[PDB]
Amino acid sequence: TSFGSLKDEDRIFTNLYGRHDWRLKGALRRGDWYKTKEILLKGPDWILGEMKTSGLRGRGGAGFPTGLKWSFMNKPSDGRPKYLVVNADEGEPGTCKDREIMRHDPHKLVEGCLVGGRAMGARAAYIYIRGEFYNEASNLQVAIREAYEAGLIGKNACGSDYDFDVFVVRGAGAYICGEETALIESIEGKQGKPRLKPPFPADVGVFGCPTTVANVETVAVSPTICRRGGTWFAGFGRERNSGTKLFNISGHVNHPCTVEEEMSVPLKELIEKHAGGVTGGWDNLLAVIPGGSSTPLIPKSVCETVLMDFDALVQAQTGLGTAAVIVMDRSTDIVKAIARLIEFYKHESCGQCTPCREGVDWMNKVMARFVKGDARPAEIDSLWEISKQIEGHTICALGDGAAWPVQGLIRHFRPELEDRMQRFAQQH
Amino acid sequence: TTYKNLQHHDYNTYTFLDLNLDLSKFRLPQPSSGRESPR
Amino acid sequence: SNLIEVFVDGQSVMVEPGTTVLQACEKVGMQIPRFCYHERLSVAGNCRMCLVEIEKAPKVVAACAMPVMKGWNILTNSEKSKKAREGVMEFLLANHPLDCPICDQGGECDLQDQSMMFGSDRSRFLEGKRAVEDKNIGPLVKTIMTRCIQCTRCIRFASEIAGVDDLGTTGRGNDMQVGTYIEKMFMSELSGNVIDICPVGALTSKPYAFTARPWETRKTESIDVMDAVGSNIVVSTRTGEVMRILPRMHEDINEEWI
Amino acid sequence: SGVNNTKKWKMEFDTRERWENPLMGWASTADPLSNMVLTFSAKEDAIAFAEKNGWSYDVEEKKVPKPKSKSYGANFSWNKRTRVSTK
Amino acid sequence: ALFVHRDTPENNPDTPFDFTPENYKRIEAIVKNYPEGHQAAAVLPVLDLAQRQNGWLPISAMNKVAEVLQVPPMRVYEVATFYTMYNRKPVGKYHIQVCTTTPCMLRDSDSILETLQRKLGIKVGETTPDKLFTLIEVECLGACVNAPMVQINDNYYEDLTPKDIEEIIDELKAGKVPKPGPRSGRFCCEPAGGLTSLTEPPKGPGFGVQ
Ligand SMILES: Cc1cc2nc3c(=O)[nH]c(=O)nc-3n(C[C@H](O)[C@H](O)[C@H](O)COP(=O)(O)O)c2cc1C
Ligand code: SF4
Ligand code: SF4
Ligand code: SF4
């Protein structure tokens, strides 16, 4: 079939621009908290089956099947509580969606936390949000108070015997704290330093208890998925890329924006049918960073004749990531752009892993030199080998995300680097 | 129709913790580990 | 009897559950490299030097932390493991100081020996190194902190055995470093084992400073008299003079401490 | 932390006087068996050699370390003391 | 910066800092959010509350937080140095932090940083003599789409320009405080000129139910 052109009735995230209200009354008028009591009373297994049949995949980092991920914690009680944790930490460049969600549709997030907690047999839902999002978190807590007061949260959740506690928690300005385990440690009060897996949070997570991690988007879409059957969500993407999606389009575009479209939507249609279109025209474009800065880049020759989904982006070697398109054009220095982007990772590394720690700075220096051209081509393959050394010999995926961009750049823009080097050689 | 999210133009530093305090009364008894701390 | 059959380069081994790849290799006799691991401390996955390969697996695992599952086969002298070791040593020595002729941890350096065995023979690092402010944390322990490879052995020893909780990592990234945020002094009844435990010459003993080198010492095995425990000890002499004193493993008395 | 040196048995002697030369301060001796160290693969062979040659010998046993239970998960428990305060 | 402390007359355990009564109550309410045992999970919010009491974190405040939570002060210095939202050097009155990450950079945050450096007469890193503004360059913040942006104390100002930021800084230099949000016509994040969706109305409390 074909894809794109999603309708405002099949859209999930209304109030996306705050043109309606974001309070309990507006959420009621939009559909939130409808039948949630029966969604609960159906039981967890029902909800997990809906997740599975929905073909839903994680909307944070690497899309992983939410059904299996959440059923990992469908288990008995070893004598400890069991928690849910929503990583509202949204620090990956080009991403501005969770902010809008948390400040416009917080009641959806509350309902999704409740539903996931029931699905897992949990007790409390911590929401770890960036410490820079102060007003957004304040609105979120206002909504949580509205719920606690109404009676949709707490002891008798919505008319059942389920008790649930929703807590908000703030960070202090760290990008690594988006990681499953770094977030957990930061909540526990330690530094934002990840853990080695195993063990997996499903067994030993927050405070040592079974904690399931999730994302704002995923948990907030869960309820609509449940009350719409899964076969609706499922029928908008390819066999495995099913679902709507939030795309943050920025860069050298006329009208940068944040949109919700059908998955498998051509990037070109996403830039034209929305976003106001690239600046200078379709031919001024140079390349794209589709799925966030961590992901590598693809040039125009592929940006055209390409879809937008985990598969058919893996083929182009740039995973979908967070769906944060960063467009560029012929009036740029891709080397300087990606060098600043690697400096980002150099600053945001936590420190412990040898490869990451001692190699992201090496790479930042090498790229700062490559910009001017104070090198010789023999260093490009060395950069490649170093990136490959960092890729899989780390703890978390920050090293992988810092390596992939260099691979993409060296693979699709090598002649520019060689020319810069030759020009430096000429003008010693 | 026009913009609505204009409540945050007047928030203040201690807002979030004031509300966390207001809700501490609605919270439920947390569990226990049988220990004051890991010592 | 709750045991598991594992393979190490093809050879079968019986191991208890919860046992690690490193431990299985040791039970066979093989020995995985180490910088951050020590039998008597908690486990961390920082150095990334224990990385080996599992038959039918794309990613290399950490032998210090990965408990061995049934049926796994472990490839220790494989190209993937060796490339991982080479890269990790490249990174470790990227920002290391060329202080080996000043470093009293000179002929005893695990980093030296592992660079020679499992590491390459040249550098591709043509950039500028870093330097660190050296602390002062007592009259016994000398600190040249531009040699720390951030293994955390000192922090863990202190937190666990000596019950101090005064060492830690302040900062993040390559700008990170170890020690106390203040000029605190580390004077415990056990302060002095951080010296033997630090794989490098970042922590050294001020008394033994510059007096000798390992290949000169003659080593006798004796015991303590200071207390009534009988800690097994090594006395290292040179031309008829006592130069230092070291522990000696006796797992029923002192287990590597003095 | 290497153990490639605890694998072969060794036979050495008792140490004797090692005094100072007046001229230069060097270390002087008269025992010609002070730097004599022999290597064996078995205590039985070591002791047989010692007996053969006619030396009164003391013997020590191979102090092997114990097997240890390690659990990276123990550093994050909800109830125990093994919980670690720094990652 | 530096991750080492040398005691000065401005920073030392003798430096005066205690918690207010209302903030003690807030601390109690915070600690009641974590289980009985595992109460060191409040270090971050407590440090932030101390920053909000005084806009910078002294060694005395660190030791006080440690005394409160019965946690050693090393496990507080670690956090304070790890997380960048903590101020161990005294900040000014308004803490401008400009995103210089690739999106905002190619949408020319460089030019606004130049405008700001020129206007304030001080360069990145340092503060003003009157101790009113502190300027910093910073990484992504959550406004990439409205990329050219700033954060001053806790508010955002997006899509600004040289003239717009100069106007905001003049309003701040006066005794007046502005209102946060995009300063380029657009409201929050919608496409410039209008909408490409949400042109129709929503569905009532019931729809697509099954
Ligand atoms: C450096 C780094 C940053 C990350 N940032 C985020 C993030 O901002 N949001 C997020 O949801 N996940 C982030 N992740 C990965 C999360 O573990 C993952 O998204 C989450 O666990 C999946 O939640 P889901 O069930 O909703 O898919 C990050 C991982 C790394 C290594
Ligand atoms: S890869 Fe880097 S950021 Fe991730 S845990 Fe290791 S040191 Fe920290
Ligand atoms: S620890 Fe000392 S001997 Fe070992 S590599 Fe470093 S400087 Fe050389
Ligand atoms: S000082 Fe020595 S023991 Fe401590 S972390 Fe550094 S290398 Fe390891």
Ligand code: FES
């Ligand atoms: S010994 Fe395994 S990571 Fe250090």
Ligand code: FES
């Ligand atoms: S890149 Fe500047 S706000 Fe994200």
